Amino acid sequence: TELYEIKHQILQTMGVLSLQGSMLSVGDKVFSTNGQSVNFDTIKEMCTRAGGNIAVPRTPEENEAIASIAKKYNNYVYLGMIDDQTEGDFHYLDGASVSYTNWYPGEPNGQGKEDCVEMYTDGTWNDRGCLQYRLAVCEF
Amino acid sequence: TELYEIKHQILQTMGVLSLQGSMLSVGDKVFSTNGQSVNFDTIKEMCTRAGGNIAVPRTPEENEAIASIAKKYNNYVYLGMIDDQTEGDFHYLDGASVSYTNWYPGEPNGQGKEDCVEMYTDGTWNDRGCLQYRLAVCEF
């Protein structure tokens, strides 16, 4: 009965955090923002410090969840993808090539100097430099 | 030692949420509000979306907990009871007849068109229509 209780209590705490607007759950992932806007490198640091990672959508469902955060907070969001070494070749921060995409029409159109990806409030993507201030969204 | 640790960490997270004023614990139940006022149907949706249910007190202790939220937020609260099909016969949303009551004197006095229950800041109840804006309180 220790284990049933443990699960119930976890469900309660997650429920509270969800109600408060502090987390969104999509499958195995939890997304969260504290509402702050900073550049891409600072978002990475902020998420890592919290024990998570800069958010990236790998499915339509995850894109929709992150989009809803962009919408609720009315700001563009940096995503956990880059095209550093290879150009036009976006990779997650774990090194793996991106699969799911949701590019805004015409994108990625980027310079060799647009190594980051931002999400617009409508959930679509634009390759961009990494020094803009964007909503910090993390995944856990 | 995995299990002891797990319990400690749950206690910590619940402690934090409690300190922050984001949850109240009464026996097996956790109550929470995000401070928003909406109608009865929208409260149900909001609580369900968070993984919970619109709050209802089934004991004096639960009434007191929900009352304290009504007081802290200075608003009347819709409770998880209705008298839809039967009239004067209040039921929880699980279909079961209500046991514990805390009616304000003279109540329920309601029209066939007072199918919901609201709680006043003093913890007492009034049957009411369901289209008023009331503090959203959920249970998990």
Place this chain on the structure above:
Amino acid sequence: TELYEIKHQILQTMGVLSLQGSMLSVGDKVFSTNGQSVNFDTIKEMCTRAGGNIAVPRTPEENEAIASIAKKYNNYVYLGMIDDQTEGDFHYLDGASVSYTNWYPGEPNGQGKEDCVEMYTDGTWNDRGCLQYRLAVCEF
């Protein structure tokens, strides 16, 4: 697989709370404040009500964590130590003699009527009366 899941979900909720700025984790301890300032006795009550205790640093790492809260909230903080019965002899609230100290130069200089300990925003300590208003920081 129930147990792995349970651990992941706990890590997620702690991550969210950390991101939100609602908790700091140092070893086995979690520190949190709701931002309120009250006297020493009221802090004890507030922390106990949440299921925790008034915070006290017992290591350099814990002092630094509590200092960062003092800094972020720009207020002095009461710590969980007193010199009630014995004078000049500080004890934790569990009765045990204090080990780690971080006194500001000249302190403790206190009257027999400075039975509490406050922390300055720079992390150093001053013995003080207990009736001042200080930032409430709890440990769990």
